[PDB]
């Protein structure tokens, strides 16, 4: 199964900078949403998941056709809470009907990253809604109570190599775990609606103690009320991936090219972008545009 992106017949940069300008201005406007972090943190959440039940292997799910919107992937426990995204992101399709749902969900995450004061995130349009027996089977995200040959071996399968994997993890400096969502609680920091490279200097830097949560399950956590879920906390277990721990904790720039570069990637995974496709469009943020 080849994927092969299609642009929305006759837009342009200018109608996605209209959607992205819209998720933009619900995401400040709704601001009270999970204690005042608002939606930026769990719009990232969702991106992520839409696209990372892709399998290299076969080109199986992805974000190039939009199956969360059917009940399999959304009722995925995995996913549980990202049903709030969803539903942020409904008045949004209202507007721009003519928006695929693959390019509305990833969109979304480019829009929270770039509006946390995040990098600019390349997007490209033409993800095409495919149909419901195109949803992949739950199971294909990932486990968090598990270790670094774990993540590792996981992330081969959306074809991530160690430096892409660490930058991705840094998005979990954004809003927190959830009992009730996944079985783990708490923030990973104090930046937590601000995209920046917290999550690798608390790694570093917070005295952790393992500790179990009132679900039972064991989390790294701190005295300043931080935690790391075992997955995290497998980045500095590692020697491989602490060095790049390391690395991003050091220099915010080369986190946010690298993040960039890999967030983009996942969003992308799957996809055909024929060789007369548009370039990737880079979104001005509202500050940017004086909104
Ligand atoms: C080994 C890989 C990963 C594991 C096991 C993992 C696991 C988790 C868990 C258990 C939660 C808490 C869900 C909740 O209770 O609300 C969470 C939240 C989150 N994750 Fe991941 N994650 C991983 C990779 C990523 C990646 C690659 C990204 C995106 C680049 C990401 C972005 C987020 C965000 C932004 C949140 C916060 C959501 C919110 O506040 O609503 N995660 N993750």
């Known amino acids: 199964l080849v994927h092969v992106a299609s642009v929305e017949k006759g837009r342009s940069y200018?109608?996605?900078?209209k959607v992205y300008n819209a998720i933009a201005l619900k995401l400040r406007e709704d601001d009270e949403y999970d204690n005042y972090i608002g939606y930026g943190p769990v719009l990232?959440?969702?991106?992520?998941?839409?696209s990372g039940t892709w399998d290299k292997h076969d080109n199986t799910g992805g974000s190039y056709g939009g199956t969360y919107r059917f009940k399999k992937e959304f009722n995925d426990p995995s996913n549980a809470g990202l049903q709030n995204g969803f539903k942020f992101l409904?008045?949004?399709?209202?507007e721009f009907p003519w928006i695929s749902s693959?390019?509305?969900?990833?969109?979304?995450?480019?829009?929270?990253?770039?509006?946390?004061?995040?990098?600019?995130?390349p997007w490209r349009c033409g993800r095409?809604?495919?149909?419901?027996?195109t949803t992949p089977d739950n199971g294909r995200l990932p486990d968090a109570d598990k270790d670094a040959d774990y993540v590792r071996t996981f992330f081969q399968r959306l074809n991530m190599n160690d430096r892409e994997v660490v930058a991705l993890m840094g998005a979990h400096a954004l809003g927190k775990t959830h009992l009730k969502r996944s079985g783990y609680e708490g923030p990973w920091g104090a930046a937590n609606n601000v995209f920046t490279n917290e999550f690798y200097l608390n790694l570093?830097?917070?005295d952790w103690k393992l500790e179990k949560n009132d679900a039972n399950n064991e989390q790294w956590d701190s005295k300043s009320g931080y935690m790391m879920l075992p997955t995290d906390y497998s980045l500095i277990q590692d020697p491989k991936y602490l060095?790049?721990?390391?690395?991003?904790?050091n220099d915010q720039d080369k986190f946010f090219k690298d993040f960039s570069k890999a967030f983009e990637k996942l969003l992308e995974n799957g996809i055909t972008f024929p060789k007369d496709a548009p370039s990737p469009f880079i979104?001005?943020?509202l500050e940017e545009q004086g909104l």
Not at 90 to 94: A, M, R, T
Not at 128 to 133: C, N
Not at 243 to 249: G, M, N, Q
């Open 14 to 17: 200018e109608d996605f900078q």
């Open 44 to 50: 990232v959440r969702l991106a992520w998941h839409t």
């Open 90 to 94: 409904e008045p949004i399709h209202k």
């Open 102 to 121: 693959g390019d509305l969900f990833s969109l979304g995450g480019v829009t929270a990253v770039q509006e946390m004061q995040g990098p600019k995130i």
């Open 128 to 133: 095409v809604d495919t149909p419901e027996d």
């Open 204 to 206: 570093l830097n917070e």
């Open 243 to 249: 060095s790049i721990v390391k690395e991003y904790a």
């Open 283 to 285: 979104f001005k943020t």
